[PDB]
């Protein structure tokens, strides 16, 4: 319904400033620490070099933010763009997650990437569709044997398929929620709670940036990367079904 | 389909690597340029500095680094909010579209939690919004189409063409009003190239979101009404997006 | 025992112009930036620019871009401040001083004194 | 840009009294230095990093402040103290100075 829609349009606008009310006061006090830092650098800096006038130190640091703002890493095998990069680069496109933590220099690059992904992102979704599909195959099969359990124990049928519904969730979330955010933990050295940040900003493709685990290959554990790359496809395709479901539960509210 | 499964995962893959091969050749030479231009800034300041040897260089640099990846500006020492009230609402709105542009990091461990809490329920309440919003604007772009489509039908054009002409003229005017106004508008209002525009438009349609270039997040613009307003072409662009593709796939099918 | 030490009182014309100079000794002048502050009479210290004596990077006051240029010998470890288009306004005392966060050594001053 | 406020800009003392100056800043710095000066003669650092001092300073002075406001202190007049306290700052150039605070003995 028209009237409905105008609801529920009035309603999203106040989540959203519901949202900003709540972000600006978790966030607003803390929106000048990295000046803060930056600047207590600088002064320490002067302090330890008197042969460095501060105004020089100014010049070596837009030097430097170009450079970095180029693609320059600060070193004491760190390249964007060799192929493997690159590679996890183009799947943050058609999966639409878009980290971004590494910018597109040139416009012969984003105009490429315009059609890339104009192309990319419904063929993947097709890829996506079918491998939902095949997972919940799967799992619902799996969770059909601990089925047979419930229903010898004269538990309702319409019960028995609720329980395997949680289970179907349940069972995924370990497998594509916790333990991922276990697995960055102590491969990142993230805390728990930046982990689970991380991949749930992954999962919902909404990809900030903030946090990126498999950009790049680690040597001493060769599956990690791979292993990353395994998981956000199939976590994606799980991740589809957990939204479709708590968007009936919003309907049916 | 299994046969079709596998073939399909074989095609993306090469469609990656494909896409890898790309963006090494068009991006890696410039990003090789910015390393080498990191390292010359350095060299050329030991060379002036003889208080300053090259791995205390090396650590005011990674520290450097750090804090204008925390959105430190090089320019200044120490006015304008990133947390004021418009730039958060328009903070949320990235989340539930899944834009997730990114250009401000949350800092706080609440800030983080309460994101985990403000997506899930905000983004398939969203998408019920969009599929809404989907056949609500189909709806009435159909019915002033049907108008013009007498018009075709007299001219004994078949209808099978005419059908096939209006939908032409039906994106052709989505398209209009939704990816070439806006490029236009923002070329203008944001100092940036027709094409940095469109990069910027198609990105955040598709929900990419990379953060490279964000409307309305520049500093010194006077501004207020813009950036939410911007979100009004967000939510009438997308569900187009949205409710095109969807009948065209319906259309397939 | 550090030592800036400022050459003598000058008196000059208006329009003219003038340098004046400081010696260092007791340190190694390339090691440090020297700075120039202007004190007219018994009122608040201002600071003209800085320059490096190793490098030869100078930065001024906006308010003194126009009129000071410092320079350095660096075999003779002497700092050099000229003023140009001298005004009465300039009539001051003005001090080398060594430092690049606090100025922890200063020039004895040396007057200047313009008027026709 | 950063401008210094030192008032009041004259003061007295008698010997044995304690003596506080402050300075207040138009906007945050890290640290706030002080200078020394006697009629006839340049500035001497005095205090510096807002509470370290200079060489031949006695300890019956010291430093403190943070953010937008600093200040100096004497424990206890002397009468060789009497002089004009200068602040000055360094966390954004350009560098700038206090107008100074005149510090006379009472009688």
């Known amino acids: 319904r028209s009237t409905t829609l105008l609801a529920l349009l009035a309603l999203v606008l106040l989540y959203l400033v519901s949202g900003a009310l709540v972000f600006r006061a978790l966030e607003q006090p803390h929106e000048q620490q990295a000046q803060r830092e930056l600047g207590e650098v600088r002064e320490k800096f002067l302090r330890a070099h008197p042969c460095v006038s501060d105004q020089e130190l100014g010049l070596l640091i837009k030097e430097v933010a170009d450079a970095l703002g180029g693609g320059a890493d600060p070193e004491t095998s760190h390249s964007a763009w060799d192929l493997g990069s690159a590679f996890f680069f183009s799947g943050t496109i058609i999966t639409t997650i878009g980290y971004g933590n590494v910018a597109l220099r040139t416009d012969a690059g984003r105009l490429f990437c315009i059609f890339y992904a104009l192309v990319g992102i419904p063929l993947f979704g097709i890829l996506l569709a079918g491998v939902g599909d095949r997972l919940g195959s799967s799992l619902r099969h799996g969770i059909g044997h601990i089925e047979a359990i419930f229903l010898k124990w004269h538990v309702p049928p319409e019960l028995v398929r609720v329980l395997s519904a949680m289970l179907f969730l349940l069972i995924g979330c370990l497998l594509f929620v916790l333990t991922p955010t276990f697995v960055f933990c102590y491969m990142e050295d993230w805390s728990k709670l930046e982990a689970i940040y991380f991949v749930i900003v992954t999962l919902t493709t909404v990809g900030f940036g903030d946090y990126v685990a498999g950009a790049d290959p680690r040597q001493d554990s060769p599956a990690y990367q791979p292993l990353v790359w395994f998981w956000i496809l199939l976590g994606l395709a799980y991740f589809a079904s957990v939204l479709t479901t708590i968007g009936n539960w919003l309907r049916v509210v | 389909r299994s046969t079709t499964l596998l073939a399909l995962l074989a095609l993306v893959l090469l469609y990656l690597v494909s896409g890898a091969l790309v963006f090494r050749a068009l991006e890696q030479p410039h990003e090789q340029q910015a390393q080498r231009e990191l390292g010359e800034v350095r060299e050329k300041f030991l060379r002036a500095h003889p208080c300053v040897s090259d791995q205390e260089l090396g650590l005011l640099i990674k520290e450097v680094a750090d804090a204008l990846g925390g959105g430190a500006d090089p320019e200044t020492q120490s006015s304008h909010s990133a947390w004021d009230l418009g730039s958060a609402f328009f903070f949320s709105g990235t989340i539930i579209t899944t834009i997730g542009y990114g250009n401000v990091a949350l800092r706080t461990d609440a800030g983080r939690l309460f994101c985990i809490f403000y997506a899930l329920v905000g983004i398939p309440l969203f998408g019920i919004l969009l599929a809404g919003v989907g056949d609500r604007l189909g709806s009435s772009l159909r019915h002033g189409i049907g108008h013009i489509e007498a018009i075709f039908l007299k001219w004994h054009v078949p209808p099978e063409l005419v059908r096939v002409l209006s939908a032409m003229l039906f994106l052709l005017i989505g398209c209009l009003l939704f990816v070439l106004t806006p490029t236009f508008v923002f070329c203008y209002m944001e100092d940036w190239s027709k094409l940095e525009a469109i990069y910027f438009v198609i990105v955040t349609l598709t929900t990419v979101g990379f953060g490279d270039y964000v409307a309305g997040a520049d500093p010194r613009q006077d501004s207020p009404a813009y950036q939410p307003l911007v979100w009004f072409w967000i939510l009438l662009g997308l569900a187009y997006f949205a409710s095109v593709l969807t009948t065209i796939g319906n259309w397939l099918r | 025992e550090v030592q800036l030490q400022q050459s003598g009182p000058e008196l000059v014309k208006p329009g003219a112009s003038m340098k004046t100079s400081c010696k260092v000794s007791?340190?190694?002048?390339?090691?440090?930036?020297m700075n120039w502050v202007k004190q007219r009479h018994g009122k608040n210290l201002e600071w003209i620019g800085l320059i490096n004596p190793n490098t030869g990077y100078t930065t001024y006051n906006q308010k003194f871009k126009g009129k000071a240029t410092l320079t350095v010998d660096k075999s003779s470890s002497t700092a050099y401040m000229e003023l140009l288009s001298l005004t009465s306004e300039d009539s001051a005392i003005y001090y080398c001083?060594?430092?690049?966060?606090?100025?922890?050594?200063w020039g004895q001053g040396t007057t200047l004194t313009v008027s026709s | 840009q950063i401008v210094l406020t030192q008032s009041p800009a004259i003061m007295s003392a008698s010997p044995g009294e304690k003596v506080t100056m402050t300075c207040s800043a138009s906007?945050?710095?890290?640290?706030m230095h002080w200078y020394q000066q006697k009629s006839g003669t340049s500035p001497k650092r005095w205090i510096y990093?807002?509470?370290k001092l200079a060489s031949g300073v006695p300890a019956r002075f010291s430093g403190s402040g943070s953010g937008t406001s600093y200040s100096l202190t004497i424990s206890s007049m002397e009468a060789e103290d009497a002089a004009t306290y200068y602040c000055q700052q360094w966390s954004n150039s350009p560098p700038t100075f206090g107008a100074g605070a005149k510090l006379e003995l009472k009688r």
């Open positions: 001083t060594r430092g690049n966060y606090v100025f922890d050594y």
């Open positions: 990093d807002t509470s």
């Open positions: 906007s945050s710095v890290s640290y």
């Open positions: 007791g340190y190694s002048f390339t090691g440090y930036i």
